[PDB]
Amino acid sequence: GLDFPEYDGVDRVVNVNAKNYKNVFKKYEVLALLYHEPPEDDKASQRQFEMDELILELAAQVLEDKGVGFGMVDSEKDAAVAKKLGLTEEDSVYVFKGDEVIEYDGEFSADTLVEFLLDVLEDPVELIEGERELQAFENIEDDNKLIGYFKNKDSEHYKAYEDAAEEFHPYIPFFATFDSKVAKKLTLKLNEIDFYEAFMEEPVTIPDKPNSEEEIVSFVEAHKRSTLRKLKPESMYETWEDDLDGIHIVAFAEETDPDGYEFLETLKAVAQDNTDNPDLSIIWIDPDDFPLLVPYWEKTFNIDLSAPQIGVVNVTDADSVWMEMDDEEDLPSAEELEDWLEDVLE
Amino acid sequence: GLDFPEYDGVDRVVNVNAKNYKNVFKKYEVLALLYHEPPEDDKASQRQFEMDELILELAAQVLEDKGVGFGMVDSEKDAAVAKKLGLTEEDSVYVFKGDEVIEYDGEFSADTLVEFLLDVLEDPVELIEGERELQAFENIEDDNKLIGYFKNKDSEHYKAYEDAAEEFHPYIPFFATFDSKVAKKLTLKLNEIDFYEAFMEEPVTIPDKPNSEEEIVSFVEAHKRSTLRKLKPESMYETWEDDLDGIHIVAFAEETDPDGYEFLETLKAVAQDNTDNPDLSIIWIDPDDFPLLVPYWEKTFNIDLSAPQIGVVNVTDADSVWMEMDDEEDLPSAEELEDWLEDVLE
Ligand SMILES: *[C@@H]1O[C@H](CO)[C@@H](O[C@@H]2O[C@H](CO)[C@@H](O)[C@H](O)[C@H]2NC(C)=O)[C@H](O)[C@H]1NC(C)=O
Ligand SMILES: *[C@@H]1O[C@H](CO)[C@@H](O)[C@H](O)[C@H]1NC(C)=O
Ligand SMILES: [Ca+2]
Ligand SMILES: [Ca+2]
Ligand SMILES: [Ca+2]
Ligand SMILES: [Ca+2]
Ligand SMILES: [Ca+2]
Ligand SMILES: [Ca+2]
Ligand SMILES: [Ca+2]
Ligand SMILES: [Ca+2]
Ligand SMILES: [Ca+2]
Ligand SMILES: [Ca+2]
């Protein structure tokens, strides 16, 4: 029978240098550039560099037909190109779509990169027309989302909303509808924009509508750090490095597992009860999203990720404390969680 | 501060040859061997071979602490070793756990390989004691599962049950209880074994209890092909190559998406209504499980995997037919699906 697709071994990652970098940007709508330090001469360093190149090669093969290019910029050999393009963070990926530039800070894998770039290709604002499109919108809960009601696609207040959407694309989805019926179900006046914090039932409306590009961006910046945030591969590093006071409240819960789903519903509740605390942000990690880190997590934290967990992690040395839970008795409720949090921090 | 783990570039994949293969099998509890053809000389083939070596290297690093080794066996240079070990399927992975041998036939990626090998390390039979462990068992539906009720692990009929579990480890989970309360909830007599076909509400009891090792293996062999099957990466190739009559009924549905969950519930219903048809076998593909194949699938089948799909695929040329659904009307019902498949097949 016909075989599944496979990596064909063809090289597609452009070696970007001073003479071709201008042609490359014109060739591709979306361009992903790995800004890297010159590979050390030792064996292991040469292998690490090799792994990262092939990951780009595999991604380039997948996204060749959709017009996504992949390039490498050497921090010394191509230093002038780094200067003209603004590549500062060493050993990191930059994504270019038309004008805007995205400083990728997520997992460096073929799966995650292709997913992220496919989201990048999409327009910054997604429209909602039928009730099924609204019902899909109302079901999002692991991303902060915005919804606005505007008269037409040509409205001046919509372009400001769209321009603001470009500042957070694709991490934070921006939705808009021109159907008053959908707007009525959401209690959205004309040109009003609602911000739904992740895992929160009731939204927050942006004051002083209509809103300009700057008013929207300022609002999102002040509200993007949700009280409960999910560790997603597209942004795991940005999220983890955003520690409040040198520690993270980490909770492991497998959504598909019954014990994991129940424990998550408790977390959502604790977050809803304490959503106004400006210093509280809990990281939810679904171990199913990071299969390669599970053994490392069980080893470092001395926990069994087959059962739900919650703890405090020192981001400096990975020192940790974890709430103990009985495998026979029922899982702790919001009351027990709120009390366990207050004690370990006091 | 502290960095996430990374590939360190150290080589851990053993070059298995006639002089070391016996020492290797004594070193590791679980050993995965890539039986591979000698690498071709061209550039592209040299990259493909390189890609596959690093994927093994990445898994070798993740599972070093848990005692899992990784080796490569060349079909010509190590042909005598392949002879002694029984490595016939070229360019494929063989996993050895003590005595048993598992002929891996799944996705060749680090994520899937580590997930699979971690399941191999687990014992073949998982026990159920409390109420929470029971409810976790009852939630499984994408795997065929077995459950038996015995007196204790020293029982003769439990040891026969455990020996049979090794023949299907870890693809088919074998569960067992010694708790009479749990047995009552499952309507299980003593030494009775219930077989829950995937996506089915009611089990099938193995007749002529108590059952021997061979009676169980035979029963599972005759029931392994569930009427509805999920394409899982650990076994995607085995599933796909098991064409009914040179064709597959393929259904795409993203479980987390509301429209995909409903269409899956409809699929579950259609499967339950025809579970006694020996020829009907539907493959369910969750596009979230195969992010690198989504562009290839949308291009080949001319479908949009953001909406649920169902169709018939010729396994020889990837020719296909797909049920058109309106993006504004409600999703098709079980009857409408039964009406579309029987129509295209007649
Ligand atoms: C699936 O497609 C294959 C070809 O891609 C079909 O096989 C051909 O069938 C015709 C007559 O049916 C023969 O003349 C050709 O020689 C066959 N070619 C090959 C390569 O097998 C097959 O019939 C199709 N299956 C269905 C169910 O339509
Ligand atoms: C984290 O660990 C460091 C030592 O590595 C220690 O100095 C610091 O105080 C710890 N932080 C907290 C919040 O305990
Ligand atoms: Ca370069
Ligand atoms: Ca997103
Ligand atoms: Ca309002
Ligand atoms: Ca205003
Ligand atoms: Ca909040
Ligand atoms: Ca070898
Ligand atoms: Ca399994
Ligand atoms: Ca029964
Ligand atoms: Ca008998
Ligand atoms: Ca059946």
Count of C-beta atoms within a 10 Å radius of residue A241: 10
Q: Which atom of ligand 2 is nearest to the CA of A245?
A: 13
Strands B92-97 and B125-128: unpaired
Q: Which of residues 21-80 of A touch B (CB under 8 A)?
A: 43-48, 50-51, 54, 57-58, 62-63, 65-66
- Quote the CA–CA distance of A81 and B275 in Å, as a whole number: 62
**Whole-angstrom Cα distance, residue B276 to residue B245?**
17
Contacts of B134 in chain A (CB under 8 A): none
Q: Which residue, among A318, A322, A327, has the nearest Cα to A337 in the 3D structure?
A: A322
Structure tokens at A48: 């690490």
Rounded Cα distance between B216 and B152, Å, is: 19
Q: At what angle are helices B131-139 and A258-273 packed, to 10 degrees?
A: 100
Point out which residues pair with B312 in neighbouring strands: B249, B321
H or E stretch at A283: strand A282-285
A136 neighbors A145 (Cβ within 8 angstroms): no
A125-226 classified as CATH 1.10.510.10? no
Residue A290, phi then psi, degrees to nearest 5? -135, 65
At residue B81, the 3 state secondary structure works out as: helix
Same fold, B125-226 and B227-346: yes
Task: Give the total residue count for chain A.
Answer: 346
**Fold topology of B227-346:** Glutaredoxin (3.40.30)
| Amino acid at site B255 | E
Residue B233 near residue B289, CB atoms below 8 Å? yes
Place of tokens 């016996």: B22
- CA distance linking residue B300 with residue A2, whole number of Å: 13
Q: Are B159 and B212 in contact (CB under 8 A)?
A: no
DSSP B94-154: EEEETTEEEE--S--SHHHHHHHHHHHHS-SEEEE-SHHHHHHHHH--SS-EEEEE-S-TT
Query: Which residues on chain B are in Cβ contact (under 8 Å) with A292?
Result: 58, 62, 110-111, 114
Summary count for chain B: helices (H), strands (E):
12, 15
Residue A39: asked if its preceding bond is cis (omega within 30°), the reply is no
CA distances from B104 to B29, B89, B92 (A): 17, 10, 7
Distances (CA, A) of A308 to A314, A323, A327: 20, 10, 10
**Strands (E) located in A166-239:** 174-177, 193-196, 204-205, 228-230
Q: In Å, how far from its chain's centre is CA B181?
A: 31
The answer to whether A44 contacts B8, with C-beta atoms less than 8 Å apart, is: yes
Angle at A128 between CA A31 and CA A133, to 5 degrees: 100
Q: Are A218 and A251 in contact (CB under 8 A)?
A: no
Residue A30 backbone class (left: φ over 0; alpha: ψ -120 to 50; beta: rest): beta
Instruction: Provide the 8-state DSSP code for B176.
Output: E
Do A12 and A57 form a contact (C-beta atoms < 8 A)?
yes
Sorted by where each begins, the domain ranges of chain A are: 1-124, 125-226, 227-346
What architecture (CATH level 2) is domain B1-124?
3-Layer(aba) Sandwich (3.40)
Min Cα distance A211 → chain B (Å) is 31
Q: Does B85 touch chain A (CB under 8 A)?
A: no
Contacting A residues, span 287-306, partner chain B, CB-CB under 8 Å: 291-296, 299
Residue of B nearest to A66 (CA): B295
In what side-by-side order are the strands of the sheet with A228-230?
A: A228-230, A282-285, A247-252, A309-314, A320-322
Residues in the ligand 2 pocket, defined by CB under 6 Å: A 246-247, 314, 316-317, 319
Which residues of chain B make contact with A237, given a CB cutoff of 8 A?
A: 4
Resolution in A: 2.7
| The pairing of beta strand B320-322 with beta strand B309-314 | antiparallel
Exposure of A11 in the CB half-sphere (CA atoms within 13 A): 12
Q: Which residue has the tokens 């190109």?
A: A81
Is the minimum distance from the CB of B246 to ligand 1 under 6 angstroms?
yes
Q: Read off the tokens for B105.
A: 């036939």
Interatomic CA distance for residues B114 and B62, integer angstroms: 8
Angle between helices B334-345 and B258-273 (to 10 degrees): 60
